């Protein structure tokens, strides 16, 4: 399911990041990096949700998990 993040989407992300020429093998590496980051943040969010004895991951859980990782997010809650 990681193939949903497609070559054009990674190209758009790199373009927003200021990249001009993109190697062929960078797409798989980007997919792996995104998967690692998502795994970490989602694990923290699921821990938060399990603590509250809930079954739906709330935006607050994601915000707390991100702030825990050192990546504070603005505009999706407290």
């Amino acid at each position: 399911n990681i193939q949903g993040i497609t070559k054009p989407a990674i190209r758009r992300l790199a373009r927003r990041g200021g990249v001009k020429r993109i190697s062929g093998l960078i797409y798989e590496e980007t997919r792996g990096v995104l998967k690692v980051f998502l795994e970490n943040v989602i694990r923290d969010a699921v821990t938060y949700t399990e603590h509250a004895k809930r079954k739906t991951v709330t935006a607050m859980d994601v915000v707390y998990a991100l702030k825990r990782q050192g990546r504070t997010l603005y505009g999706f809650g407290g």
Partner: peptide, 13 residues
């Protein structure tokens, strides 16, 4: 409204 939420989050942080 989105900018207002961003500002509220900034104040809280």
């Amino acid at each position: 409204s989105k900018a207002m939420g961003i500002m509220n989050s900034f104040v809280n942080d």
